[model samples]
Target chain A: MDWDKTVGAAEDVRRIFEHIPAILVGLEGPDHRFVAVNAAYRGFSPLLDTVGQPAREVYPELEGQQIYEMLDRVYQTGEPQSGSEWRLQTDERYFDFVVTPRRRADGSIEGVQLIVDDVTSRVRARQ
Target chain B: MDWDKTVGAAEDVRRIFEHIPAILVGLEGPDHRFVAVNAAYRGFSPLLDTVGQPAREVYPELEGQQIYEMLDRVYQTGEPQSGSEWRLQTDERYFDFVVTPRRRADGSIEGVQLIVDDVTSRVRARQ
Candidate 1:
């Protein structure tokens, strides 16, 4: 919304990625604080301010899901994970997502970055 | 992508709006150059850098569409327009969209903002 500084190619790229349909989240530390989140990601819950909150407690719907283990493993091994059409029963939505470890210059895993798309429409389309 | 700058509630709000599934665009002046575009909006034609391009020329598929007239009227009258289930012939997509005039404090219309959702999934599900 600030028009004053919106000039340059990097700004163009930044603005383009900012409003993408795909959900993007950046978490820092093993505690998984919501370091970053994008617009489509808010569809998860716009009512609650999730940024700076721990991801684990935000979604009680996540209790039964293996998401905890997934993130832990990604950080633990510094390995990235990707999946398609993964359905969460409680959330009642289908999604395609990737969780990758964010690393530092010294080669330590800082946290993880998540890219997700709510593919419920695609799942519903098949029905 | 820059971590050093991501802080505060306003940053959270800006990031959220930037990456929503709903496509967003901002145009300036009567010629309607793409002044602002978000992620989902890039799905329109990301191959071409559109930030400075005229909206009419960017989407050649818009040739026969009444979009030119619609924007003209909206800007001319400073009236906001919204529609649902509007299907584009060439694009073969369904959408819900709103176009509103961006006005100045001095009571002048500076530009227009667009928010759109490609409701193609819902449209496809009906079949």
Candidate 2:
């Protein structure tokens, strides 16, 4: 797939991710193929090579989970979803993410943007 | 305070918040004064007049809550905080916000930006 065509407008999105101190990702199509990821994502994630891959392939077991379901909903309803936190088994990391639906000028859903922040530091500090 | 002097560079942040369909707000100073807000915040909220106010005045009981403490941490460290969900009782409406700490050229925190999204729709749908 021509991934850059989908997320090339994300220069500003990139800055948001860089300064926001979180893992921000953008995916294209229903398969949720990765279009882009930010610097912060590279920090918390050990598998930094998955930037241009699909979410399902990256986190296979999470395919039908609430997080995946939310991604599907954004693509289906063309609406955004926010404030959902989940514990991922792959890396045993806890993060909260907000998924926003991407739309075209014609007002149709194109893709989804997921902003993930690792709060494990806070969680671990409390424990 | 010359608030715009702090947040004027957030034009892209504004677009990210607008397109993401969330209540995005930027604040300046330790008091967390409002600096900017987007169109989505104007929607799903009636007490729109409070956009430029301090979070402490907006929600008194939440002053020492985990949410406030998180904001303080970001400002003190000149780091950004994200991905924490809390039930806010302001105006009797529920909201989920991601508070990002903003920094200036000298590597000191200039303020905090709070991107709030009203997840009451999803919360209501379940109940």
Candidate 3:
């Protein structure tokens, strides 16, 4: 490990998260319009122009599922919720993620940040 | 938000972690040797070469502190421990971090990962 080089690169981690191979989205307000969505989130679908749009308008397919409900739960409670290997079906394919609340310094609920992992390969391999 | 552009940059998050602004380090084994130290970790001091070294040797100043003991407890318990706004005195200054355990696919302890945020500015401003 070139320790010096590693430190030099650390400055870019936040920027890296913006483009990393995961879904990084920042939503604000009870309306849950997309305040921010990272590269990987947009990469999922070029048509997913979700920023400034509410979740229902963007992902009506996720209705009746607990995804939207959980966001409301975190917003109301100011507590984070996380899970792994959980399945999220979209158009017949599955995705996995660990979602948590993003809080302000005063402990106020700002929104939720979703870090998604594409587990389609593993799910398919097992099937 | 150029939704398409953000998606294009999402491929390098893991690599970005290697050099992010936060102090990100990976430790392994009960002995707690440094398996990985990111750029920010080394940037703290060009002389602080801690990789492959045990915590006791690298951070002897932390003696009798809960940091090392907490690492031991995580290795023993397989549960993650996290805290915030806590002060860690080093020399005359202080730093803050959230520490958690790393686990393997079998759910066994692999090591610990520490993400540090420098709170010196806020701490000093208040003083």
- The candidates' DockQ values read 0.08, 0.06, 0.08
Q: Is the docking of candidate 3 incorrect, acceptable, medium or high quality?
A: incorrect
* Model 3 chain A weakest 10-residue run by lDDT: A7-16
Name model 3 segments beyond 4 Å from true. A1-127, B1-14, B88-91
Residue A32 error, candidate 1, Å: 11
Q: Which docking band does candidate 2 fall into? A: incorrect
- The top-ranked prediction according to lDDT is 1
- Residue runs of model 2 more than 4 Å from their true location after superposition: A1-17, A21-23, A30-40, A49-87, A94-100, A115-127, B1-17, B27-39, B44-100, B104-106, B117-127
Q: Give the per-residue lDDT digits (tens) of candidate 1, residues B34-112.
A: 7666556666545556767777877766767778788888788998888887887642788888787766659887667
Q: Best to worst by TM-score, what's the order?
A: 1, 2, 3
Give the candidates in order of DockQ, highest first: 1, 3, 2
**Interface root-mean-square deviation for each candidate?**
7.4, 10.1, 8.6
Candidate 3, residue B14: how far the Cα is off, in Å: 6.2
Please provide TM-scores, in order, for all candidate models, with all chains considered together.
0.49, 0.48, 0.46
Per-residue accuracy of model 2 over B2-104 as CA lDDT, tens digit each: 2122111233333343444445555667877655544455564445455446767765677655677777787788666556335666554456666766666
Cα lDDT computed for each candidate against the true fold: 0.66, 0.58, 0.60
Residue lDDT tens for model 3, B1-127: 4423342232233333442334566676888876666555777645676756788887777776667887888778866666555565543345666566665558777667665657667767885
Please give the lDDT score at residue A61 for candidate 1: 67
